[PDB]
Write a protein that binds this ligand. Sequence first.
Ligand SMILES: CN(C)c1ccc(N(Cc2ccsc2)C(=O)Cc2cncc3ccccc23)cc1
Ligand SMILES: CN(C)c1ccc(N(Cc2ccsc2)C(=O)Cc2cncc3ccccc23)cc1
Lengths: 304, 304
Amino acid sequence: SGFRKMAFPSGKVEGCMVQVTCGTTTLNGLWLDDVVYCPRHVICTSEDMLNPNYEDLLIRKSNHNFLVQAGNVQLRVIGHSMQNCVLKLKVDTANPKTPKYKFVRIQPGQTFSVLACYNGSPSGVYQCAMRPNFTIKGSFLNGSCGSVGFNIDYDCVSFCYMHHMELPTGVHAGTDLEGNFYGPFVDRQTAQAAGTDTTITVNVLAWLYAAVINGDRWFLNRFTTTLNDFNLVAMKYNYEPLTQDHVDILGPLSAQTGIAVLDMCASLKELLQNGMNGRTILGSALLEDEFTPFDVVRQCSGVT
Amino acid sequence: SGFRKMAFPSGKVEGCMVQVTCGTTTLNGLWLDDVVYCPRHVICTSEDMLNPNYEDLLIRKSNHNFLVQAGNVQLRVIGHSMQNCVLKLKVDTANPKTPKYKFVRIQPGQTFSVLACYNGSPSGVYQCAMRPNFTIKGSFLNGSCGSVGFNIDYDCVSFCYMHHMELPTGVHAGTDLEGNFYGPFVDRQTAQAAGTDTTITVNVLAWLYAAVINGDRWFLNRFTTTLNDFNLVAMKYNYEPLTQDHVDILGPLSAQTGIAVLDMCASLKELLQNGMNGRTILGSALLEDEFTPFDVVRQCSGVT
Ligand SMILES: CN(C)c1ccc(N(Cc2ccsc2)C(=O)Cc2cncc3ccccc23)cc1
Ligand SMILES: CN(C)c1ccc(N(Cc2ccsc2)C(=O)Cc2cncc3ccccc23)cc1
């Protein structure tokens, strides 16, 4: 028992982290096979970041200008190319620590672990969710660019995120591993509207099932609701509309606890309408949405 | 910016995790040099756990009865000994992945990362605090025994905890790496009083400094207090008494924000007396105490 914001063990990703220096800019890179992936803004200086002409800046750079350090040893850059907002530096040595990996584009509402790095060295690991507005409320300082988000299924690491930028609002933005930004963001130091965010209803409900599994049952009530009545409450409280697919993904948690999904919905409805009343659920005084139904079953079953 | 419950990157600890099977019991072990450390209850069966005679149970066991698997390869056990509540299985092969390490006894209120493992395989990593009553509110299922808690200073891993038991209350108990239980607990399946817990005042104050650093300032007020007046409030709200040493450990955060420690104390006093009023601080609707002053400066500076 016990329920925590658990991240995947970062070991397989730590072995892929390198330092990438171009000119006076240093950030992190992801060494997989004979390719180091890093944010393309490594080629910029502070003067460039207002509106960088990346194609032009990259043309002034050659293979020898990209310094790649993997711990204390230097990697030999034999090629370079830009793909969307990432640079792919081809190196003459495949990473011996390359795990089985995949490049995935995650959906908003899904979670992943972040391995925050500085100068190609890992500082820490935390679990977070891709917000419905495609931002991440991470913990990132200057030089954290190039840190990646991932999920691990057995021995296969699915890289989903690469860190590029902190918006003036303090929230974070980045790309998939093909360099495509999540959300409407661009890699320019400019005011960028993040868009209206919502709470991930399915994840809150999944977390409500984890609370019942782990002992917390005070919020359970004698009521039920319909998807329609629930969605009217979800609308008023800026919660994502709940669909039959969300009810289906909650099937296992519903079967384990014997609490019908619409019965759990009615409990969430009462919590939205009345608050916690000074009470807690799994050590939180607010409704948590950073745990997916899969994360709950994984943590409550013990998959390694 | 951004503030998260960040755990240390678990890589160096993952490389030390092995599976230890004795009879019909399987749990995790920590392979450092030519020694595998595991909870001594590996020698028990369900029938034994009510009141095990560990000296007697161990006498029926020989080196060949302790099966130690490091991934897919078997380790050869050449010696065995009990030290407090841990078994030390001497093996004929030093772990090639042994990092620079230390065995430390942590103080209550300090934090550490936990690498939850099952069958010698890591499932996840989370950050937690040693409660003032020496329990840990972890996330542990059956077979998680042998999972360790640690801190990492550069390349040196300081092992502080080993998991042994979940109390009937759902909280966790374990030992230092010399097998000494933290708190009054014994490795017997019996009702065990955990003792009165308190909130880690210094850590709450440290977290209040992290909130100001990361943008959250609504709780700052026009008041100040004394250690005496604050301690009267801390008493009423089951908070640890604040001492001059705690004020001294908060010196750096006070210097960075320019907010005097007693001024921050007066803000915490108002939050204790009036609650959050439906507001949040760093994404939490309650007062967080799982971040030490050192954790705050580390996360807000970027140490790797
Ligand atoms: C000097 N240098 C080239 C540089 C300089 C700044 C950045 N930018 C701006 C920007 C614009 C468009 S794309 C990035 C970042 O946003 C980098 C960054 C990320 N995360 C957390 C941060 C906290 C504090 C400062 C910077 C942070 C990238 C690069
Ligand atoms: C069968 N076997 C030998 C066994 C069987 C049970 C345990 N115990 C009891 C106990 C008594 C004294 S020392 C341990 C544990 O407490 C083990 C444990 C730990 N963490 C989370 C758990 C969740 C569910 C079930 C067990 C959990 C240890 C060993």
